[PDB]
Amino acid sequence: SVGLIWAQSTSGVIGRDGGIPWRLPEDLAHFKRLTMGHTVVMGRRTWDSLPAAHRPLPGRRNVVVTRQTGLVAHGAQVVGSLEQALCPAEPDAATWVIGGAQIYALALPLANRCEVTEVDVDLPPEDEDALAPVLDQTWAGTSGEWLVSRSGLRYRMHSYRRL
Ligand SMILES: NC(=O)c1ccc[n+]([C@@H]2O[C@H](COP(=O)([O-])OP(=O)(O)OC[C@H]3O[C@@H](n4cnc5c(N)ncnc54)[C@H](OP(=O)(O)O)[C@@H]3O)[C@@H](O)[C@H]2O)c1
Ligand SMILES: CCc1nc(N)nc(N)c1OCCCOc1cccc(CCC(=O)O)c1
Numbered sequence: 001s002v003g004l005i006w007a008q009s010t011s012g013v014i015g016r017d018g019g020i021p022w023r024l025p026e027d028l029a030h031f032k033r034l035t036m037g038h039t040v041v042m043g044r045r046t047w048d049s050l051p052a053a054h055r056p057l058p059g060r061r062n063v064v065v066t067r068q069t070g071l072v073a074h075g076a077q078v079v080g081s082l083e084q085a086l087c088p089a090e091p092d093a094a095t096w097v098i099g100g101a102q103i104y105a106l107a108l109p110l111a112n113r114c115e116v117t118e119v120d121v122d123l124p125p126e127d128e129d130a131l132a133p134v135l136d137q138t139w140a141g142t143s144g145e146w147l148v149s150r151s152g153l154r155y156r157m158h159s160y161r162r163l
């Protein structure tokens with residue numbers, strides 16, 4: 001079972017300028033709760049985007065997908081394709097693909113679950129933005145209530161499963 005987890009603005013933006021263009025502590029807490037103890041698979045750009053105290057993400061098996069031969073990622077396992085990341089020598093009951101846009105597009109056909117945070121922040125897309133995948137009719141989901149963060153942003157969590 002492979003799941004995707006991401007946070008997006010309502011407009012679909014997930015990344016800008018090498019980072020995430022809002023601050024939402026409640027989403028980071030949700031991400032920690034869903035992923036702790038499990039495998040997290042990410043593209044190399046997302047690995048390079050992690051803040052220092054989160055590189056590697058503590059308490060998870062970190063896997064980094066790159067085409068670079070010989071890349072060392074201290075605290076993570078380096079693999080050469082998403083398929084390799086999903087064929088571990090040591091199986092894990094739960095594997096989460098945690099971004100970014102390039103890796104989500106490769107992972108979506110292989111996944112059966114998506115956990116999405118929607119953030120009500122106005123971000124007209126800009127040309128180098130990383131965008132969320134769009135879930136088609138093969139997916140169905142459920143939505144939590146709109147909540148207000150302690151920092152003031154409206155947000156809500158959606159849970160999708162493959163039909
Ligand atoms: N809001 C969220 O939930 C969320 C989550 C994660 C990331 N983000 C944001 O998203 C952005 C990063 O996303 P991104 O789309 O630019 O990059 P990405 O998907 O994280 O990483 C892209 C890299 O993955 C490797 N890769 C891609 N396709 C591959 C393939 N077929 N085989 C092997 N390796 C492959 C390449 O690494 P090499 O160049 O090393 O070969 C490529 O440069 C950042 O802004 C980050 O902050 C947001
Ligand atoms: C929490 C974002 C997130 N949220 C969900 N729901 N799914 C994800 N895959 C997801 O990204 C996980 C990879 C990035 O991890 C961190 C971890 C800690 C602090 C930051 C700040 C980024 C900034 O402020 O630029 C980023």
Ligand SMILES: [Cl-]
Pocket residue numbers: 032054057058
């Ligand atoms: Cl974390």
